[PDB]
Amino acid sequence: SLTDSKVKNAKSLEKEYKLTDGFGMHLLVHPNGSKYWRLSYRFEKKQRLLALGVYPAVSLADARQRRDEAKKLLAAGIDPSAKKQADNKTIQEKR
Helix, strand or coil: CCCHHHHHHCCCCCCCEEEEEECCEEEEECCCCCEEEEEEEEECCEEEEEEEEEECCCCHHHHHHHHHHHHHHHHCCCCHHHCCHHHCCCHHHHC
16 A cells, blocks of 8 residues: 555656555656546456556645545446646645
8 A cells, every 4th residue: 555655656667667555546656747646447348447546736645535426436346547736625735
């Protein structure tokens, strides 16, 4: 399971790598320096990858919330790629 500090302190390498958080979610740490939240899921029923947002715009807590929302859509038979992820307000945006 990831922590805020592991996420913050992860450094880019030569090639992209994934830091897994569980339940299909990972942080992609890209050599471009950017950090992407992603969810692996199955639907229709191929394996797919969902973008959940960009750190630090989206925190680890925020990413887990967006994962949860995607799992709810999946459970209702809705492809979670149809969702505008930004409609999930972040904890800071809430402020």
